Amino acid sequence: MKITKDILITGTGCTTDRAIKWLDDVQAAMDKFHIESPRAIAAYLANIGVESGGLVSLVENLNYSAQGLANTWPRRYAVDPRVRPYVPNALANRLARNPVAIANNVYADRMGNGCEQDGDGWKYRGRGLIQLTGKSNYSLFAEDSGMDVLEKPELLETPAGASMSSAWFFWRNRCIPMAESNNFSMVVKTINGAAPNDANHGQLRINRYMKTIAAINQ
């Protein structure tokens, strides 16, 4: 369905100026990945807006102190993950305040990435609205979209790439059937990792979902 600037603002909480810059990219992404019904469009917009702070935040933040590393990945970066506070280990103290070195270590040898030394963890760090991480998902998105994101992963920080990759994620993770069965809670769990709650702004997601259905049907 053709959406408006006002539907996009209702759905994502974005500014008027950002809605104007993103409208055509969001429409093209939803059309490409068959996000067509009021509930599918509402569930997609409600989640991409909260995940990205209103289409503002498009890349993983890897700025950490040693204490932030221990707190975020205690099994990797705390001396002992069974105690409070966590104490940063020697690895945490070496990697702290080094975004590239953190990503290369924490994302090494998973999600399709190779070894720490060869740089895939940083290269394929989280990007987009619903962030894609790791060489495997960048590769699958490249094949499904035709976007050159292995050579140019920074395309996922453009409005076109962020919208397209989020629409791909929504389609591929079966969110369209969930939306069209009125299972918004499962859509949020699938995208965020947890059902609607305080931590993931669940009430704001639900409020924007319901408000966007109403807006579209008019």
Side-chain angles (χ1 to χ4, degrees), residues 36-103:
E36 298 292 350
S37 65
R39 285 167 296 178
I41 293 169
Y44 170 68
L45 298 181
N47 282 285
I48 67 178
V50 170
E51 286 299 332
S52 69
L55 313 178
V56 172
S57 177
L58 307 183
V59 66
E60 180 171 0
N61 186 328
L62 283 134
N63 299 119
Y64 291 93
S65 69
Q67 188 67 50
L69 289 179
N71 289 352
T72 302
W73 298 272
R75 292 183 65 174
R76 294 173 182 271
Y77 298 136
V79 172
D80 186 345
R82 301 173 293 280
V83 302
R84 187 198 308 261
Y86 299 125
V87 178
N89 66 14
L91 180 58
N93 286 332
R94 294 173 60 226
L95 299 178
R97 308 188 296 131
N98 192 334
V100 169
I102 293 161

Side-chain angles (χ1 to χ4, degrees), residues 37-44 170 174-184 187 209:
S37 65
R39 285 167 296 178
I41 293 169
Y44 170 68
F170 193 92
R174 310 179 285 110
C175 293
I176 296 164
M178 296 173 193
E180 293 171 355
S181 67
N182 308 314
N183 212 311
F184 185 66
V187 174
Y209 174 64

Side-chain angles (χ1 to χ4, degrees), residues 111-123:
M111 307 175 281
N113 293 334
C115 67
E116 172 171 352
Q117 291 85 351
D118 286 354
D120 285 343
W122 175 253
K123 183 172 181 185

Side-chain angles (χ1 to χ4, degrees), residues 7-25:
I7 287 161
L8 184 58
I9 296 165
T10 300
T12 65
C14 67
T15 61
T16 294
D17 186 73
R18 273 201 190 81
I20 293 169
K21 286 177 178 147
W22 283 70
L23 181 59
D24 289 349
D25 292 328

Side-chain angles (χ1 to χ4, degrees), residues 120-216:
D120 285 343
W122 175 253
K123 183 172 181 185
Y124 302 111
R125 68 193 180 280
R127 293 181 183 85
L129 305 175
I130 305 169
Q131 292 181 13
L132 269 54
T133 309
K135 186 177 178 181
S136 179
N137 280 343
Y138 278 73
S139 294
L140 198 54
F141 173 66
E143 290 292 337
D144 287 341
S145 71
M147 292 192 37
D148 188 30
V149 299
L150 288 179
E151 303 316 306
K152 301 181 176 196
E154 61 273 16
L155 288 172
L156 293 196
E157 296 169 71
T158 71
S163 50
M164 192 63 70
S165 60
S166 281
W168 171 80
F169 178 102
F170 193 92
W171 165 74
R172 175 168 155 86
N173 285 279
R174 310 179 285 110
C175 293
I176 296 164
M178 296 173 193
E180 293 171 355
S181 67
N182 308 314
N183 212 311
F184 185 66
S185 186
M186 210 191 308
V187 174
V188 173
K189 181 168 187 301
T190 300
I191 291 169
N192 175 257
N197 61 39
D198 297 354
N200 68 15
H201 313 276
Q203 253 311 326
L204 184 63
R205 289 183 203 240
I206 296 159
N207 191 80
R208 288 178 177 168
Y209 174 64
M210 288 310 284
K211 204 160 155 204
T212 303
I213 295 163
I216 288 171

